[PDB]
């Protein structure tokens, strides 16, 4: 079992400085040793340097850094595509969540039947026509879903993207801050999700059962886990750009990762939105990065029973 | 759609200074905008000024401020009754919990078949003969329950109260600090409650299901939600006079409020016992008031899924 | 009902200074009054003074303080035996968890069909041949289980010990930090446990039901509750030597204790590993000691409903 680790220091998917230091903070929290201890054979690609784009003006007076986010994701997809083809399970460290455009596109290139577990306080499914922020980290799913493309206009730097996934192939877990147009999109296309409310009702065990039943109940498929650290309650993960009260507990996050591992199907994992500069202290920064390592390690087989 | 907001800066139901600043703190946390955004048509009655009573001596060498609490509740009942009769759902901001004597009486003046969901760490059902503190905020239910009246002596200032609400018409949620005579009363009159222990066992979904079955399982009834902020764990709501460890989680509180909304029957809501002066910091004060706004907003339709 | 309180300041079962002050901190947090209030007739044995052993060198260049731990446990066992035979339910305040060798041996001396509920983040079942720390507080179960005895070598000071528990007679609750050799031992001897993961899945109510089914499902047996404070999440019990994130909530801890009380079979209780010196503040120390008093009180009948 080989694991590739890729640092993707994206910040241009949003407006708050510092999320580009996420990958280093996660490494400093001891990621590599933890993965080695589980018996992972590791390839560290280091932190990628993405090619900047000159004069990357607003798109339609609203969407920020479209060409930069586009090109960085194109380059990221290439590295992800290569690593999977060489047989690595791919861990990408963020960086803001717009990089899921790149990792999922790269992952899907040769594994078009992949499925997605998107763990997040947010749906990240605004389109360029519904976003109220202009921040691409709140739009990545819209570029990836096949059924939505008639409603997603073409952004500069995005033409290389071929929507690779059906709306029945993504399940959300932990949603509690959803824009009305996203709610419309989720219902209109029958996209399955388990909000914090669904977790309160069902418990995390049944949520995972039903998640896997929806996605792999009929056939084995490579799993893409896109994990936004803000899925966790801000008391546990404060160092992040859009914290929302009432998130996953520590145990719930571990349980999710444990079940991901137990399928035997994890093929790629994003760990995004850790922003050490948004912590009010270095303990808060470190606790967030430490939590990130716990998720990744649990996702690759670390247990709570030895 | 119409919602009335009434500030009741009640402190004489207890002895700790500052709870009378509860309504202002909740307003400053943005209550009105939150209600407006949900589509509530709003009438703000402002903060009431209650008529003082001269020489309001202890009753029986124990019960404090009886006439002041009695008259203030009489005046509050008049305002609530008027607002409910004009078609408003009535939100009352406290202030200590003795004001539920006024809001429930006033509410019942219009809607006599109302039922009550009492969310609280405490039962608040001591009588003047059982109270060990003399504080009327730990007695209000005793003046309201029809089955108890012959064990409830007549206090000065209380003669206007005609308690018409049956013991089968109130359900408690969150109880963990119950005085022995209150335990006796709950058992002797077969009053239903879900303690923190019951929540631990059943989970909050089943608790709400069973609550509504008991209250509205046979017929539709207007619901009075009397929500003591101290139902929440002290970590989440520190700014309150009688905090008790082991309370509701944030998610549990939201879920209760959501189920209240989903009945379509909410006719009045109390949000009581926020005391900004008991916070160790402005942050603890603001988090408590923000939490109060979350409960109220969720009770009137705010969701965690957009 | 009669309860004996025994202070056991031991701290030679591990390497961190200050756990020997655990009993005084628990007493100072109001233990005796809380117990009196429940109707417990109390005998206070005070804090025992254990006979020191000179030149108590490492065993096999690894195991620390063996004769000291051996002798202190012999002396503790005598006191527990005497108290149980004289009709007391026995509360032993620690002190590190190696003293369970003594309390369980003393208890089993005249109640040989006793069963054990071990509430702990850890399995405490390393042997002198598997421990990586040499600390006896992480080995006590190995000296107590009949089935393990041919693989547990003879330590100086330990010859008085006669293993008094079959592997089907102990159930663990709360495990999240288990050494691989301990995991091997647990599976190899089919010792039943409920990890934090099991609690996440089943809920604490089902965990307790199944716990009692296994232990007392066919016959009534005296119950020995060995409660390591570190079973609780570190946010609730920070003053302890080996904290592990993702522990029991406050409510879960109370629920365990309530269910122990509800069997009517509790015969002895250990409350171990409170180390007030490990708190970063006096507040952190007191909250840990207060939590310890809450467990003990709930185990002898304190309720959350009056
Ligand atoms: N839905 C979001 C949040 C996206 C977060 C992206 B992620 O990747 O961390 O899930 C988007 O930008 O599209 C926002 C949309 C609406 N805004 C509301 C808001 C914006 C600014 C302020 Cl000051 C207060 C409130 C915040 C959430
Ligand atoms: N049951 C109470 C508390 C009710 C709180 C009212 B509410 O509205 O906040 O639910 C009452 O005054 O009737 C009290 C009755 C008993 N006392 C016990 C006590 C009093 C003082 C102290 Cl310092 C320590 C303990 C505290 C609770
Ligand atoms: N299993 C333990 C801990 C048992 C704790 C006993 B108790 O009573 O508090 O449950 C043992 O000493 O046997 C240890 C075994 C392994 N070590 C790992 C470790 C040791 C030292 C350091 Cl600095 C970092 C990690 C710590 C736990
Ligand atoms: Mn997010
Ligand atoms: Mn996201
Ligand atoms: Mn209360
Ligand atoms: Mn109250
Ligand atoms: Mn232990
Ligand atoms: Mn332990």
* Tokens describing residue B149: 């009246």
| A239: phi then psi, degrees, rounded to nearest 5 | -80, 75
Gap between the terminal Cα atoms of chain A: 19
Query: Which atom of ligand 1 is least distant from the CA of A97?
Result: 8
Sheet of strand B192-195, all strands in order from the earlier edge strand to the far edge: B41-47, B2-7, B89-93, B266-272, B223-228, B115-119, B170-175, B192-195
C41 SS3 class = strand
Q: CB neighbours of B100 closer than 8 A, spacing ≥ 6?
A: B124, B140, B141, B144, B226, B270, B272
- Paired strand residues for A115: A223
Which alpha helices (H) appear in B158-249, and where do they start and end?
180-188, 196-202, 204-216
Q: Provide the 8-state DSSP code for C58.
A: P
> Does B150 count as an annotated binding residue?
no
Round to whole Å and give the CA distance between B228 and A116: 42
Please state, in angstroms and as integers, the Cα–Cα distance from residue C242 to each residue in A30, A110, A260, B34, following that order. Answer: 20, 46, 28, 45
A residues 287-306 near C, CB within 8 Å? 294, 303-306
Q: How far is the CA of B47 from the centre of ligand 6 (A)?
A: 22
Q: Which chains touch C (3 or more CB pairs under 8 A)?
A: A, B
- B&C contacts, CB < 8 Å: 41
Q: Which residues contact C129 (CB under 8 A, 6 or more apart)?
A: C151, C152, C153
What does DSSP assign to residue C216?
Answer: H
State the CATH architecture for A1-306.
3-Layer(aba) Sandwich (3.40)
Question: What does the longest C-alpha to C-alpha distance in chain B come to?
Answer: 54
What residue's CA is closest to ligand 1, atom 3?
A138
CA dist B128 and B152 (Å) reads 7
Contact C251 B180 (CB under 8 A): no
Compute the distance between CA of residue C54 and CA of residue A105 in angstroms, rounded to an integer: 69
Q: According to the entry, how was the structure determined? A: X-ray
Query: Is A122 annotated in some ligand binding site?
Result: yes
Q: How far is CA A85 from the centre of its chain?
A: 20
Resolution in A: 2.3
Residues bordering ligand 6, an ion, CB closer than 5 Å: B 120-122, 228, 230
Conformational region of residue C95, where left means phi above 0, alpha means psi within -120 to 50, and beta covers everything else:
left
Note which residues in 167-226 of chain B have CB less than 8 A from chain A: 203-205
Query: Inter-chain contact A200–B251, Cβ cutoff 8 Å?
Result: yes
B278 CB neighbour count, 10 Å cutoff? 19
Instruction: For residue A26, give the nearest of A267, A291, A260, A257 by alpha carbon.
Output: A291
The closest of C304, C302, C295 to C119, measured between CA atoms, is C295
Paired tokens of B179: 């005085």
Degrees, nearest 5: CA angle B159-B164-B169: 140
- State if residue B124 touches ligand 2 by the CB under 6 angstroms criterion: yes
Residue of B205, B250, B306 lying closest to A179 (CB–CB):
B306
Q: Find residue B7's DSSP bridge partners.
A: B47, B93
Pairwise CA distance, residues C97 & B6, whole Å:
56
B254, B255, B306 member nearest A183 (Cβ): B306
CA-CA distance, A183 to B136, in Å (whole number)?
A: 46
Q: Break chain B into its structural domains and give their ranges.
A: 1-306
Residue A285's H or E segment, with its range, is helix A282-299
| Residue A132 annotated in ligand binding | no
Are A304 and C245 within 8 A, CB to CB? no
Q: Which residues contact B47 (CB under 8 A, 6 or more apart)?
A: B7, B8, B9, B23, B24
Angle at C46 between CA C41 and CA C47, to 5 degrees: 145
CB atoms C255 and B200 under 8 Å: yes
For B107, half-sphere exposure in the C-beta direction (CA atoms, 13 angstrom radius) is: 30
Count of CB atoms situated within 10 Å of the CB of C3: 23
């Amino acid at each position: 079992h080989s694991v590739a680790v890729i640092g993707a220091p994206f910040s241009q998917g949003q407006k708050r400085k510092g999320v580009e230091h996420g990958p280093a903070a996660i490494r400093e929290a001891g990621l590599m040793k933890r993965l080695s201890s589980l018996g992972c054979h590791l390839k560290d690609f280091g932190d990628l340097s993405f090619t900047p784009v000159p004069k990357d003006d607003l798109y339609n007076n609203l969407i920020v850094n479209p060409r930069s986010v586009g090109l960085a994701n194109q380059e990221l997809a290439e590295v992800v595509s290569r690593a999977v083809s060489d047989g690595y399970s791919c861990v990408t460290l963020g960086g803001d969540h717009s990089l899921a455009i790149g990792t999922i596109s790269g992952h899907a290139r040769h594994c078009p039947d992949l499925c997605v577990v998107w763990v997040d306080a947010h749906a990240d499914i605004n389109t360029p026509l519904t976003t109220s922020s202009g921040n691409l980290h709140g739009q990545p799913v819209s570029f990836l879903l096949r059924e939505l493309q008639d409603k997603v206009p073409q952004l500069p730097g995005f033409s290389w993207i071929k929507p690779c996934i059906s709306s029945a192939s993504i399940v959300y877990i932990g949603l509690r801050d959803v824009d009305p147009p996203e709610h419309f999109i989720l219902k209109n296309y029958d996209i399955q999700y388990f909000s914090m409310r669904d977790i309160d009702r069902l418990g995390i065990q049944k949520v995972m059962e039903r998640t896997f039943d929806l996605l792999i109940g009929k056939r084995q498929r490579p799993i893409h886990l896109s994990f936004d650290i803000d899925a966790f309650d801000p008391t546990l993960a404060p160092a992040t750009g859009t914290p929302v009260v009432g998130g996953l507990t520590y145990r719930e996050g571990m349980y999710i990762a444990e079940e991901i591992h137990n399928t035997g199907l994890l093929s790629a994992l994003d760990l995004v939105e850790v922003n050490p500069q948004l912590a009010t202290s270095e303990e808060e920064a470190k606790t967030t990065a430490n939590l990130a390592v716990d998720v990744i390690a649990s996702s690759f087989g670390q247990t709570r029973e030895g």
